[PDB]
Symmetry: D2
Subunit: 113 residues, 4 copies
């Protein structure tokens, strides 16, 4: 199967740790990068798949931004677990007139540390 | 003051209710979509500078599919004295093989108001 | 049908004008906002649809950014032509290490001016 | 110096050749995807400060479908002395009715190198 629980690291030099996905599929973890912000997510548990679909939020302790990730767990063709993800990074604006430029979008690949 | 606890609605006629957010900043809620189908939502509201219009984010875990939708946004105070939720979302679909990852993520927009 | 050719305006106070889609589907136009940058695009011409799918690029004359739009022409339920679009706004970075924060993503609805 | 004229390849094994860009800054090319299927591409390279690594953008008009793919990017000079094209893309699908607009746009990533 492909568990999320554990430590992961990405193509950007940003490690990550994930707790034990509970009954209803929730979990928490921590995110580390050049700080240490809290993480909260949910892995889709329906057809009890082996390559689950998931999503989590990160509220930074060093600023008023939020990043959300969606992604899937894959057992790569080379046998490794890989989290392919995509994110939305929201910035805090002042006026509803500047909303248009608050969202950034990116990719990010993780692996077991 | 822009608070997230409440019952919001949108441009697609999708309802959502969010409970009270705790000390840390998290909350849960329900997402009634479109059949009528409910789904639990879990997310956090940023609480750095206790800014009246915070930045939030949550996950929707579809009960009727094996996909996930993550939402980011800003609780804005509308000009006429109301709250509006501008959000962006990314819908992830489950694909059997890593080879089709490229076609598994959609992006869209949503905007909510007090029900 | 739903022609792109003409003047359009959006929910952001940014007008736009489009030339005569040629044989192969290409076109040019101009974009106006609070400057006046050039526009180049292509409307998908295959099944000669009445609500075509399209895409164009905008290279700003006031900075080193580019925005690309994809979208479709719809005859709304109220009978109006509406261009629903989504864009990617790329910023110029210095190092391949900062690439991650160059792309912004948004929505934008147009109507016949 | 990062020039766009050339034959690039990628992580998906999709080839692309772009011609010479004119004074204004536009170019055309071919997009060989995956059957082998070619598609004309049209785009512009930003030419403000004549910056060695410019910002570009183009459209791919699929010959085999009624969809459009727009690409943005930056011609970066890789650390070991090569050119890399980091791009983001948005794939638009044709939907019969405006009611399903929300589910018609995908977003992804691509990265190219000299073939
Ligand atoms: O706006 C500018 O020009 C730069 C501003 C200073 C840095 C801004 N950063 C923030 O607010 C939060 C840091 C987020 C790091 C991101 S999340 C998306 C991406 N994936 C990953 O593993 N790290 C990056
Ligand atoms: O893949 C196809 O071609 C269609 C598949 C059938 C429907 C797929 N839908 C799902 O798995 C979950 C429903 C999510 C509804 C989305 S979340 C993003 C958007 N915002 C909103 O308020 N509703 C929609
Ligand atoms: O980076 C900041 O904090 C702000 C920088 C100053 C303004 C940046 N703007 C640019 O480089 C180009 C202007 C693009 C306007 C955008 S294109 C996406 C959106 N749709 C539309 O009709 N107008 C806006
Ligand atoms: O809608 C479905 O469920 C699948 C439909 C059949 C395939 C749809 N494809 C198309 O209409 C055009 C092919 C585009 C290929 C894309 S462009 C974005 C990505 N980058 C790249 O190098 N190849 C892919
Ligand atoms: C964890 O991963 C490696 C080694 O542990 C290194 O990047 C650093 O120690 C950590 N990464 C981050 C982003 O802190
Ligand atoms: C939810 O919104 C209101 C409830 O206040 C109701 O009139 C409407 O029909 C409901 N819509 C959905 C999608 O559940
Ligand atoms: C064109 O649209 C209206 C009236 O023509 C107004 O916004 C302005 O004159 C123009 N718009 C822009 C963005 O220049
Ligand atoms: C294109 O790339 C090279 C041509 O130099 C060739 O070996 C490869 O098979 C081609 N791939 C596609 C998708 O056309």
């Amino acid at each position: 199967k492909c568990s999320l629980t554990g430590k992961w690291t990405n193509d950007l030099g940003s490690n990550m740790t994930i707790g034990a996905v509970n009954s209803r599929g929730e979990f928490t973890g921590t995110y580390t990068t050049a700080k240490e912000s809290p993480l909260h997510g949910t892995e889709n548990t329906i057809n009890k798949r082996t390559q689950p679909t998931f999503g989590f939020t990160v509220n930074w302790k060093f600023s008023e931004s939020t990043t959300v990730f969606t992604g899937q767990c894959f057992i790569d063709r080379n046998g490794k677990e890989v989290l392919k993800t995509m994110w939305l990074l929201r910035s805090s604006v002042n006026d509803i007139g500047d909303d248009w430029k608050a969202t950034r979008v990116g990719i990010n690949i993780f692996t077991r540390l």
